[PDB]
Design a protein around this ligand. Structure first.
Ligand SMILES: C[C@H](N)[C@@H](CCCCCC(=O)O)CC(=O)O
Ligand SMILES: C[C@H](N)[C@@H](CCCCCC(=O)O)CC(=O)O
Lengths: 328, 328
């Protein structure tokens, strides 16, 4: 596959998409050929120049401003029809809550076939993609949903851990995030503030940077989120592991420190066939960033998705359903 | 599937096979219809009476002595041709080191198609099954190898954990086992003593219970095993995650205490795309027995294997390659 690498694209070029591009750079079996943001796109069948695209984006507002870039207010539509791309990572803020589904309906409408991957967080966003299962399948698209850190990595770990038990009692995810680069987080931070007490997507999305800084001042830069609406729950339910109500997700983001404020882990509790109650724990290393734990799994699921696609398996899959494949 | 459960069988009815039978009892989507040991077999398309089979085995030396049992010195051959069985768990001591492969060659020769699962430990035993890949595929058999605790559960956890990293440095497995029931462990204990310093399969297999008790007396019932030949290594290599030399397996079995002498875990170390070195850790609950952590995953892989089989996917798969499916 070093002779014929998987040709991939990234939609959305905020902090996560940019990290995704950097992660792809040293891969030999995967090549980044396509990036789109809201106001432009960049295609390069020979492989994207990541430094140039990042410069363009951060200094001129869009990758359409990069060498070989194209400005466009229909960048996704234009990009889909421009290039030979085997799969895309949808690194798109789900703002509003319908956006990911709407982008997916454009892939469907386009006639394009291949693999799509997302790192959606919200159960209700994942439910919108579930409504599209047959449309995806009929379109010839293998869609990998919730394939980030959580849902994703931690969800798959819980699916594996569950095999020791006759019955599952609880899957509890606690995450920590330290923000190293403010620019890389603003434009997703409202997605998180929406999980705050007395907030929601519409309210958070409409906040000014002034109002955000004010909220953060109160809690010293810390967003402690409990019992989040998080698609891990329906994913583990669709995989037959447990009911969604037995899955709980919470976490802490420290907007003022690059160090994780706590060690991310998932605890899986259940009863074994011998009637013993016990828990497995999967814990992430403190020096693995949000970016690595989201984008790493995302492309491992893209690779896995492609394997499925190449076997004629189309439709919607979750992180809980298949083994991601290590990308080299 | 409660109307048409997967009909499964177990070959070998020492401690692990017996535990496997008990684990299957409450399942509604999987039904134990077939058990064989060296000197007899038991088939019952309506579902095995586990208490009766265990009584027969432990009190009369074979399940062939159970109500509906048949004595036979070709029990595997006879069983394969007797019943409608969708998949078998091969709960067989690999003694000698060629035995599992030889049983597998009988399934091949028989014309039977379906799923086979094992919980093999040794790299060299797994390599013998790798030589049979095409024979398996041509025979219409989906073979799931190394699908126990380690290899198996812990190997799959390492495969998932690896997705955060650009390069893997080390996968380190440390296991603990407390023996609760001596009868349930003797007849596999020689497999472990073979990993001892200054021992091997042939030497260990030829030891008398006298000589075993003597060895154990020296170390107070404790078998501390380091750098074991363990198939986790080639499995993670075949899945493209790391070289076999970066996988190390050790553990402790306490023959004199039902409590685990240490907490079983796997530590996965690597470098992320940002150049940070870090480790994830997956730890098992102390009250999850060897039996639960081996047999639970084994049947989850059988179920997964069947899914593959039903899609026309035949040949050899490892725990590292696919997501096991929770059996209810
Ligand atoms: C709050 C985040 N946006 C996200 C979780 C990131 C988990 C990272 C795990 C780690 O790197 O340890 C959850 C969310 O967006 O709801
Ligand atoms: C020594 C064992 N036979 C076996 C490991 C059992 C791991 C159980 C894990 C747990 O229950 O914590 C390894 C071996 O046989 O080589």
């Amino acid at each position: 596959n070093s002779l014929a690498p998987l040709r991939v694209g990234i939609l959305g070029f905020g902090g996560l998409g940019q990290a995704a591009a950097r992660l792809l750079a040293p891969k030999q079996e995967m090549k980044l050929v396509a990036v789109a943001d809201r106001h432009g796109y960049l295609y390069d069948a020979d492989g994207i120049d990541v430094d140039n695209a990042v410069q363009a984006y951060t200094q001129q507002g869009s990758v359409g401003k990069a060498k070989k870039g194209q400005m466009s207010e229909q960048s996704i539509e234009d990009l889909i029809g421009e290039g030979e791309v085997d799969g895309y990572f949808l690194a798109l803020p789900n703002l509003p809550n319908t956006f990911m589904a709407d982008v997916t309906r454009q892939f469907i409408a386009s006639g394009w076939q291949g693999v799509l991957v997302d790192a959606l967080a919200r159960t209700s966003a994942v439910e919108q993609l579930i409504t599209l299962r047959e449309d995806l399948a009929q379109a010839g698209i293998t869609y990998m949903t919730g394939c980030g850190a959580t849902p994703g990595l931690l969800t798959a770990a819980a699916a594996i851990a569950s095999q020791s038990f006759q019955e599952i009692h609880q899957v509890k995810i606690t995450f920590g995030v330290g923000i190293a680069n403010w620019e890389a987080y603003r434009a997703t931070i409202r997605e998180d503030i929406a999980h705050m007490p007395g907030y929601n997507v519409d309210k958070a999305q409409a906040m000014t940077d002034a109002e955000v800084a004010a909220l953060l001042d109160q809690t010293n830069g810390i967003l402690a989120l409990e019992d989040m609406e998080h698609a891990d729950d329906i994913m583990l339910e669709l995989a037959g592991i447990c009911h969604r109500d037995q899955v709980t997700v919470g976490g802490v983001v420290d907007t003022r420190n690059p160090k994780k404020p706590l060690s991310t882990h998932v605890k899986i509790t259940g009863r074994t066939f011998e009637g013993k109650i016990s828990s497995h724990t999967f814990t992430l290393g403190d020096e693995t960033s949000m970016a690595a734990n989201v984008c790493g799994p995302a492309f491992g699921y893209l690779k896995a998705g492609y394997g499925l696609h190449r076997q004629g398996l189309k439709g919607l899959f979750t992180a809980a359903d298949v083994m991601p494949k290590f990308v080299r």
